[PDB]
Scaffold this active site. Structure first.
Site, PDB file in Angstrom:
ATOM      1  N   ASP A 516       0.658  -1.185   0.051  1.00 39.50           N
ATOM      2  CA  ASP A 516       0.205  -0.066  -0.058  1.00 39.50           C
ATOM      3  C   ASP A 516       0.763   1.361   0.017  1.00 39.50           C
ATOM      4  OD1 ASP A 516      -2.042  -1.900   0.869  1.00 39.50           O
ATOM      5  OD2 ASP A 516      -1.132  -1.788   2.870  1.00 39.50           O
ATOM      6  N   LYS A 610      -3.685  12.003  12.916  1.00 38.38           N
ATOM      7  CA  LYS A 610      -3.943  11.181  11.700  1.00 38.38           C
ATOM      8  C   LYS A 610      -4.836  11.744  10.759  1.00 38.38           C
ATOM      9  CE  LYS A 610      -5.358   6.399  10.476  1.00 38.38           C
ATOM     10  NZ  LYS A 610      -3.961   5.747   9.805  1.00 38.38           N
ATOM     11  N   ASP A 791      -4.856   2.844  -3.823  1.00 33.79           N
ATOM     12  CA  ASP A 791      -3.319   2.846  -3.505  1.00 33.79           C
ATOM     13  C   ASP A 791      -2.853   1.588  -2.895  1.00 33.79           C
ATOM     14  OD1 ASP A 791      -4.913   2.725  -1.042  1.00 33.79           O
ATOM     15  OD2 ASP A 791      -3.556   4.116   0.052  1.00 33.79           O
TER      16      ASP A 791
END
EC number: 2.7.7.6
Length: 862
Positions: A516, A610, A791
Site C-alpha cells: 500500500d 492522523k 492505493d
DNA sequence: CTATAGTGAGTCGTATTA
DNA sequence: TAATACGACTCACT
C-alpha cells in the site's frame, strides 16, 4: 449497434452462444442464470429450499396482485406507481424489492426512504425494459444445445484456467448500450415507495421511522429492519440463503470492454453497465468516442484476475461469527446492547435528562450501525459459501468519474478484512525463497508491524513461529491471530505459511500480498512539484527508517505546545470589555498558555493528528480541522470520563486545528501550494464574469476539464439540484411527502466546484498510476493477477518481487515526462476567461528532488 | 466518492374512470 | 355522477 440492428429473439440468444462455445454449455447457462437473479428468483431454485426468503417472497408476491385488483376495481385516477408497475411481472417486482431493500439496509447511514425508494425504482425500471429479452433468454439457455459433446463439456478439471474472449471476435449484438435510467425521478420514487409500502403490508420485514420530527436540517423518515427479522439474520445460519446482492461475481471471464458501455456482465436481458459512473447521461456520452486504448487495456486486464474462495478461512468465519463473544473484537456483537439506566430522577434537569438524551443516543446510534454491519457480513458469508466450491470466479470492473477502478460486485477484493481474507488468487506459482520472504513480509504487515524496516519485520514473524504454526493448526483454539489488526487476513497468511513448512519452497502459493501507498496524493503532489522536504516526509526518498508523516506532524505540534505553555497568551477577561454591561457571558477566553497545557495534559500523539491531516487531500484547511479534532479526540474524551482538562472544549479544538494546519503547512508545503493553485483555478472557471450594470454574459460558468496521463479525460461539474416533493398516501395512514432531487439540472455550483477540485485531481492522478501499473506489470513482467484497491497493489508471492518495483517504475516514468499542472493550464487557458486573465496564474515552484530516488525508495510503495 | 434527497397536515383544483 | 390520487402552496415544527 446491438439495438435496432437485431431482433429480440436473436439478442436473447447471442450471449449464450458466444459464451457456450467458450467455457462450455454447462457454465454458459450458469453465467446467465446467475446474472438473471438480479431480477427474479428461480422457481426450481426457490422450491428447492424446502431461510428467510421462503416466507417473504410468497407473501410479497401475493400482495402485489391484491393491490392490482384494488387499484382496478376503483373508479377515478389510478396511483402513478401502478401505471409503471402494472406492466412488470409480479414475481420480479417482489424479488427486486425484498432483495434491494436489504442491500440498502447495509448502509449504517443513508437508509432514508428516498435512498431506498430510489434504488427500487432504478432496478424495477431495469426489469421494465430488458424484461422481454430476459424472458426469451431464460427460455433459450434452458433448452439443451445441439450436438458436439466435446464443445458442450468445456470445463474439465485440468490445471489451466478459462481464457478471456477476443474483443475483436465479439458479436455486434453484445456491444451494449443505454445504461441510464430514463424515468423522471418523481416516477421512479413513486414506484419505489409503493413497492416498500407493500413489503411492509405482506411481511413486516421493515418499518418506517420518523427521525428528528422538528429539526429543519435533520428531520427525516427511515427504513428499519424489523426486530424479530433482524434477530434471525444474526442468530440463524443462512437466513439470507436465497438473497444475493444485485451484482454477483462471475463464473467465467468477464466480457471485455470495447466501448463506453455494456462491458463486464454478459446477458442481454440485463441493464448494461457503464465504463464510467456518472451523474448524468450526456455526462457519460462525452466518452462516446474518446480513444484511450490504455484505459480500456488496464481495465480489461484487471477483470481477468481469477479468484477463488479461501476454503479454510471460510471454515473459520462460518463459525466464530456466531459466538456471543467472538475473539475478533470487531465482528458485530449478537446480543443487543441494553440502554443505560435512568437515575430515577426524572424531574431533575441539572444534566440528567439533558445529557441522558445523548447517552441513549449513542447506544441507539450504535445498535443501528451494528445491526447493519451484521447484514453486510451475512451477505458476504452467503456470497462466500455460495462460491466456496467454484474452481474460480472473476469480478467485472467499473470506474468513478475520476478514473479510480472499482469491482462491481458487492463481495469483492476491495472489501474489508473478512471479505478480503475469504478470498485468494486462483492460480499461483512455487513460492521460492523470493516469495517466502515477502509472504512473511506481508504477514508482518498484516499485523500492526509496518512502521519498521523490512528485516525487523521479518524478525517479528520468525520470532513467532510456534504461534503462527499453532493458530494455523487449530485456529479455533489458538486465537492469537484474531488478536491482530487484520485478523482474517493474517489468519489467511498463517494457512499459507505453515503450508510452506510442510512442502518447502516448492510450495505453490496464491495468497495476494499487497504493497500500500504511504500517503497517496501527498506522494503525487510531491512528485509533480518535486518537493524534497515533503516527498521524503511521505516516503518518496530512501531512508533507514519508515517515515511517518502523521508522526512528524505530531512532534511539531508538541514543540509549539511546549513553547506556548511557557510563554503564550494569558487568559482573557470576558465580553464586558468589548460591551460594558449587558453581556457578562463568555466569562472565559483562555490564552495560548492555558490551551497548550491542556493539550500537554492529554498527550497529543500520532492519533490526535492522523485524520486531521489525512483529510488534506479532501479540501480540509485550518477551519476544517476545528470540528474534526472535536468529535474525533475531545468529544469522545469527555464522553468517556477523561478529558476533564478541556474546560472550554470549543476553544481547544480551535487551538489544535491551528497547530496541525500550521504544522502541516511546513511539512508538505508543496501539496498546500498545489491545492491552492487548483482552488484558484476552478474558482475563475466557475464564477460568472459579469459587467457592471449591463449584466451581459461575458462568459458563463464553465466546468473544469483535464486529461490524465494514461489518457482518461475527466470533467468536474458540480450542479445545483432542482428539488420538489411528492404527495403519497402511505398505507392509507399518513401523507409521506419526500423531498427529492429531480433529474433536471440547472446552474453550476461554483462553491462546490472550487472546494472539490484538488481532492478530485490527485485521486484521478493516482488512478492513472494504478492503471499504468497494471499495464506495465503485465507486459514487462509476467504478473497477470492483480488485487487492486486504489492505493494498494497486490499479487502472488512469486510476482511480488516484480510488482514491487513495477509500481516504482510507472510512478517515476510518468512524472518525469509529464507536467500535469502545466498540462492542466493548457486546458483552462484556451477554454476559459476572456477579460480578467491575470490575478490567477503563478505555477508553483519545482523542487530539487530526484524522481529516481523513488526506485530505490524502500518504504514508498505506490 | 462508493451519488443524493426536511416532514405531515389543511385545502384546492383537475383529469380520469367504474 | 362523483369518487380518486396527487401536484401545488402555505404553515408550524419536542
Amino acid at each position: 449497434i446491438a439495438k435496432n440492428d437485431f431482433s429480440d429473439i436473436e439478442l436473447a440468444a447471442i450471449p449464450f452462444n458466444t459464451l457456450a462455445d467458450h467455457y462450455g454449455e454447462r457454465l454458459a447457462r450458469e453465467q446467465l442464470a446467475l446474472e438473471h437473479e438480479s431480477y427474479e428468483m428461480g422457481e426450481a431454485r426457490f422450491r428447492k429450499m424446502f431461510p428467510l426468503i421462503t416466507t417473504l417472497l410468497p407473501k410479497m408476491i401475493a400482495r402485489i396482485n391484491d393491490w392490482f385488483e384494488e387499484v382496478k376495481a376503483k373508479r377515478g385516477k389510478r396511483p402513478t406507481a401502478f401505471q409503471f408497475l402494472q406492466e412488470i411481472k409480479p414475481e420480479a417486482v417482489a424479488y427486486i424489492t425484498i432483495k434491494t431493500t436489504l442491500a440498502c439496509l447495509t448502509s449504517a447511514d443513508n437508509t432514508t426512504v428516498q435512498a431506498v425508494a430510489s434504488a427500487i425504482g432504478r432496478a424495477i425500471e431495469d426489469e421494465a425494459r430488458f424484461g422481454r429479452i430476459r424472458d426469451l433468454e431464460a427460455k433459450h439457455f434452458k433448452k439443451n444445445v445441439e450436438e458436439q459433446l466435446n464443445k458442450r463439456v468445456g470445463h474439465v478439471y485440468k490445471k489451466a484456467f478459462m481464457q478471456v474472449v477476443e474483443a475483436d471476435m465479439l458479436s455486434k449484438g453484445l456491444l451494449g448500450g443505454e445504461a441510464w435510467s430514463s424515468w423522471h425521478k418523481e416516477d421512479s420514487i413513486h414506484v419505489g415507495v409503493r413497492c416498500i409500502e407493500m413489503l411492509i403490508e405482506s411481511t413486516g420485514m421493515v418499518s418506517l421511522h420518523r427521525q428528528n420530527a422538528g429539526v429543519v436540517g435533520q428531520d427525516s423518515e427511515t427504513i428499519e429492519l424489523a426486530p424479530e427479522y433482524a434477530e434471525a439474520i444474526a442468530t440463524r445460519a443462512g437466513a439470507l440463503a436465497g438473497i444475493s446482492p444485485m451484482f454477483q461475481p462471475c463464473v467465467v471471464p468477464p466480457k471485455p470492454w470495447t466501448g463506453i458501455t455494456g462491458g463486464g456482465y454478459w446477458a442481454n436481458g440485463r441493464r448494461p453497465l457503464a465504463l464510467v459512473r456518472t451523474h448524468s447521461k450526456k455526462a457519460l456520452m462525452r466518452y462516446e468516442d474518446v480513444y484511450m486504448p490504455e484505459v480500456y487495456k488496464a481495465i480489461n486486464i484487471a477483470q481477468n484476475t481469477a479468484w477463488k474462495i479461501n476454503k479454510k478461512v471460510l471454515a473459520v468465519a462460518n463459525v466464530i461469527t456466531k459466538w456471543k463473544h467472538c475473539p475478533v473484537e470487531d465482528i458485530p456483537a449478537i446480543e443487543r446492547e441494553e440502554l443505560p439506566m435512568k437515575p430515577e430522577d426524572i424531574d431533575m434537569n441539572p444534566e440528567a435528562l439533558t445529557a441522558w438524551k445523548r447517552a441513549a443516543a449513542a447506544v441507539y446510534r450504535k445498535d443501528k450501525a451494528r445491526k447493519s454491519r451484521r447484514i453486510s457480513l451475512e451477505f458476504m458469508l452467503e456470497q462466500a459459501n455460495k462460491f466456496a466450491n467454484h474452481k474460480a470466479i472473476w469480478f467485472p470492473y467499473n470506474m468513478d468519474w475520476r478514473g479510480r477502478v472499482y469491482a462491481v460486485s458487492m463481495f469483492n477484493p476491495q472489501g474489508n478484512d473478512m471479505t478480503k481474507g475469504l478470498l485468494t488468487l486462483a492460480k499461483g506459482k512455487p513460492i521460492g525463497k523470493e516469495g517466502y520472504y515477502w509472504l512473511k513480509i506481508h504477514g508482518a504487515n498484516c499485523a500492526g508491524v509496518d512502521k519498521v524496516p523490512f528485516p525487523e519485520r521479518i524478525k517479528f514473524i520468525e520470532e513467532n513461529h510456534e504461534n503462527i504454526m499453532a493458530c494455523a493448526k487449530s485456529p479455533l483454539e489458538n486465537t492469537w491471530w484474531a488478536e491482530q489488526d487484520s485478523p482474517f487476513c493474517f489468519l489467511a497468511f498463517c494457512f499459507e505459511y505453515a503450508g510452506v513448512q510442510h512442502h518447502g519452497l516448492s510450495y505453490n502459493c496464491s495468497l495476494p500480498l499487497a504493497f500500500d501507498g504511504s500517503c497517496s496524493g501527498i506522494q503525487h503532489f510531491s512528485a509533480m512539484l518535486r518537493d524534497e522536504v515533503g516527498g521524503r516526509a511521505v516516503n518518496l526518498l530512501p531512508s533507514e527508517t519508515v517515515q511517518d508523516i502523521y508522526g512528524i506532524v505530531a512532534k511539531k505540534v508538541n514543540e509549539i505546545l511546549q513553547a506556548d505553555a511557557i510563554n503564550g497568551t494569558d487568559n482573557e477577561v470576558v465580553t464586558v470589555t468589548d460591551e460594558n454591561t449587558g453581556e457578562i457571558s463568555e466569562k472565559v477566553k483562555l490564552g495560548t498558555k492555558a490551551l497548550a497545557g491542556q493539550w500537554l495534559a492529554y498527550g497529543v500523539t500520532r492519533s490526535v493528528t492522523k485524520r486531521s491531516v489525512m483529510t488534506l487531500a479532501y479540501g480540509s484547511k485550518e477551519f476544517g480541522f476545528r470540528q474534526q479534532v472535536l468529535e474525533d479526540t475531545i468529544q469522545p474524551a469527555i464522553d468517556s470520563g477523561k478529558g476533564l482538562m478541556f474546560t472550554q472544549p470549543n476553544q481547544a479544538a480551535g487551538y489544535m486545528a491551528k497547530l496541525i494546519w500550521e504544522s502541516v503547512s511546513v511539512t508538505v508545503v508543496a501539496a498546500v501550494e498545489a491545492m491552492n493553485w487548483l482552488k484558484s483555478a476552478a474558482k475563475l472557471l466557475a464564477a460568472e464574469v459579469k459587467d457592471k450594470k449591463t449584466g451581459e454574459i461575458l462568459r458563463k460558468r464553465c466546468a473544469v476539464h483535464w486529461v490524465t496521463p494514461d489518457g482518461f479525460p475527466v470533467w468536474q461539474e458540480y450542479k445545483k439540484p432542482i428539488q420538489t416533493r411528492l404527495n403519497l398516501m402511505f398505507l392509507g395512514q399518513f401523507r409521506l411527502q419526500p423531498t427529492i432531487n429531480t433529474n433536471k439540472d440547472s446552474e453550476i455550483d461554483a462553491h462546490k466546484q472550487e472546494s472539490g477540485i484538488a481532492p478530485n485531481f490527485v485521486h484521478s492522478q493516482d488512478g492513472s498510476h494504478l492503471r499504468k501499473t497494471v499495464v506495465w506489470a503485465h507486459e514487462k513482467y509476467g504478473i497477470e493477477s492483480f488485487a487492486l484497491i486504489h492505493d494498494s497493489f497486490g499479487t502472488i508471492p512469486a510476482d511480488a518481487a516484480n510488482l514491487f518495483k513495477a509500481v516504482r517504475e510507472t510512478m517515476v516514468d510518468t512524472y518525469e515526462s509529464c507536467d500535469v499542472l502545466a498540462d492542466f493550464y493548457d486546458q483552462f487557458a484556451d477554454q476559459l476567461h476572456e477579460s480578467q486573465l491575470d490575478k490567477m496564474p503563478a505555477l508553483p515552484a519545482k523542487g530539487n528532488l530526484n524522481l529516481r530516488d523513488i526506485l530505490e525508495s524502500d518504504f514508498a510503495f505506490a
